[PDB]
Structure 1
Amino acid sequence: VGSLNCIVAVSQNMGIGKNGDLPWPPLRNEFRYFQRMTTTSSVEGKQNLVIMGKKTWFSIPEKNRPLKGRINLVLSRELKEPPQGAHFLSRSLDDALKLTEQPELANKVDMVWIVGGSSVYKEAMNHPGHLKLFVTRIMQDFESDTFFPEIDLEKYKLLPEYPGVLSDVQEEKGIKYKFEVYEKN
């Protein structure tokens, strides 16, 4: 796999989660952005793969699992088999990427998206070679118990724009946010 994508939404205090859910009220267009970015593939015959930790999997409402139109892979050191509805299970990020090149997934996976949580992001972001980080900056503090680190501008560049990503401040339910894209090579 020659590129990875991470996608995350963060509060001003770097929060991503609280009590097994998001720290903020539901932002429907932000969710639709997540859906669009992770699902969209114009390569006929293939789907994108989403990789996530176990707590992130159980944080998705059961009626939306597995995430439709995507191959869903969960990371766990304890399971077993994939949780009910998930397509695949791997014991590490390295194992997950290796799995995509084996016969079952060989001609089936287009883009790989890392969708959380904290550990999965940390390792992906240190992974050699090309990485893009799609970061939604929610422009408020929210009480949180799970966090995303400050991005190191030594390794990553904030792209001034990116095709298909809106550049202006967004607002839903009185909450302002903006879509950012970072890249390292």
Structure 2
Amino acid sequence: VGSLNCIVAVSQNMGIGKNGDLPWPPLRNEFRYFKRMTTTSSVEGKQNLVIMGKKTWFSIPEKFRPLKGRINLVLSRELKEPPQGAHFLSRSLDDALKLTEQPELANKVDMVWIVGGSSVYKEAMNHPGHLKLFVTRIMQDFESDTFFPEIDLEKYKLLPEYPGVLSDVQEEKGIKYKFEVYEKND
């Protein structure tokens, strides 16, 4: 199995959702970046795995569920089988990463992308090991009810650039944003 990553878009007041919807108007090119990063696999004959909580799965419009060309795993203790359209279910992030060693996935999965929600990001960000965070900074405040956890800059280093990631300021629908990549190894 390859690298462990989180990917998120976040407003200036740390918002990542409002009642299960985007806090901001849809940004087409920002979503195209999410699809490219999460879908593109370095290794022949493997796909990347996306891991998400239950409320993040059901936030996705039905037409975009499952994320095509990626293996889709949902975290839940209440569900007893994967939701309609999903491929795998685990009770926790720790269990999911353990599954990734088992015979039905060990040779199938390249990179692992954690796509939400807040408590799933917090557990991944606070566990030891090598982890990257791909953070889109949406450069204004938007009303939110769910937030990204604190990034401890002691341990996460902001990289000076990264291949396939634009380093300058972007703008769609009058909203400025920029892409960043953070790396820890502890």
Unaligned residue ranges in structure 2 (runs of 5+): none
- 1:103 Cα deviation from its structure 2 partner: 1.1
> CA-atom RMSD, angstroms?
0.9
CA contact (8 A) 2:15 2:146 kept: yes
- 1:104 Cα deviation from its structure 2 partner: 0.8
CA contact (8 A) 2:46 2:109 kept: yes
CA contact (8 A) 1:15 1:147 kept: yes
- 1:125-146 CA deviation, whole Å, 9 max, x = no partner? 1122110000000001000000
- Provide the C-alpha distance between the structure 2 equivalents of 1:74 and 1:133, rounded to a whole number of angstroms: 20
- 1:3 Cα deviation from its structure 2 partner: 3.5
- Provide the C-alpha distance between the structure 2 equivalents of 1:60 and 1:85, rounded to a whole number of angstroms: 12
- Provide the C-alpha distance between the structure 1 equivalents of 2:67 and 2:37, rounded to a whole number of angstroms: 13
CA contact (8 A) 1:2 1:129 kept: no
For these two proteins, the number of residue pairs brought into alignment is 185
Moved over 6 A (4+): none
- Provide the C-alpha distance between the structure 2 equivalents of 1:24 and 1:84, rounded to a whole number of angstroms: 28
TM-score calculated relative to the size of structure 2? 0.97
- 1:32-74 CA deviation, whole Å, 9 max, x = no partner? 1000000001311100000000010011110111000000000
Does the residue aligned with 1:127 lie in a helix, a strand or coil? coil
- 1:97-116 CA deviation, whole Å, 9 max, x = no partner? 01111111111000000000
CA contact (8 A) 1:21 1:59 kept: yes
- Provide the C-alpha distance between the structure 2 equivalents of 1:142 and 1:12, rounded to a whole number of angstroms: 8
CA contact (8 A) 1:2 1:130 kept: no
Unaligned residue ranges in structure 1 (runs of 5+): none
Identity %: 99
**Which residue of 2 is the match for residue 21 of structure 1?**
21
- Provide the C-alpha distance between the structure 2 equivalents of 1:121 and 1:2, rounded to a whole number of angstroms: 18
- 1:149 Cα deviation from its structure 2 partner: 2.3
- Provide the C-alpha distance between the structure 2 equivalents of 1:157 and 1:184, rounded to a whole number of angstroms: 6
Does the residue aligned with 1:19 lie in a helix, a strand or coil? coil
- Provide the C-alpha distance between the structure 2 equivalents of 1:17 and 1:34, rounded to a whole number of angstroms: 16
TM-score calculated relative to the size of structure 1? 0.98
CA contact (8 A) 2:121 2:149 kept: no
